[PDB]
Design a protein around this ligand. Sequence first.
Ligand SMILES: [Zn+2]
Ligand SMILES: [Zn+2]
Lengths: 36, 46, 65
Amino acid sequence: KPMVNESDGVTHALYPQEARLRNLTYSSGLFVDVKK
Amino acid sequence: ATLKYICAECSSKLSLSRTDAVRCKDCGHRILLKARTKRLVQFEAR
Amino acid sequence: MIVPVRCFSCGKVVGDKWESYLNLLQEDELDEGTALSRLGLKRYCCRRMILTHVDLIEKFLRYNP
Ligand SMILES: [Zn+2]
Ligand SMILES: [Zn+2]
C-alpha cells in the first residue's frame, strides 16, 4: 500500500489528500522474489 | 500569547524558525499552515 | 451552503424559515408544497429559494479544525 520514503524520516503510510498537497506521487512498493 | 504555524490534523499552534525541521509536537504530519493575521481586516458589507 | 438571507427576486426575508421548514417536514410530517405555504412563502420567487436550497454547509462542518 502507498508509502513515502523521505530522508530524515521513516517511510510514512502515504495518503491521497497528503500526496496532493505535498506534490508527491501516490504510488507504492514493487517486490519480487529474485532467485539466484 | 501569539503563535505562527499550525498542524493540519492535530490543529496545534506550533511554529519555529530556520532549520527546525518541518514536523509537529506529536503528529509527524509534515504539513503546517500559517494562522491568520493580527492586523484585523475590513469588508464592504455588500 | 447555508440558507440565503432573503430571496434574490423580491428580497423577502427567508433566513429564519430554514429550520422551521425542515421541521414541518421531519416532525410535522408535511409535504414541501404545504410546508412552504405554512411559512408564508407565497410566490415562487420565495418558494424556489427554500425548496431548492442545498444546505451543503453541513457536509462542510463535518470536517474538523
Ligand atoms: Zn501535529
Ligand atoms: Zn421572494
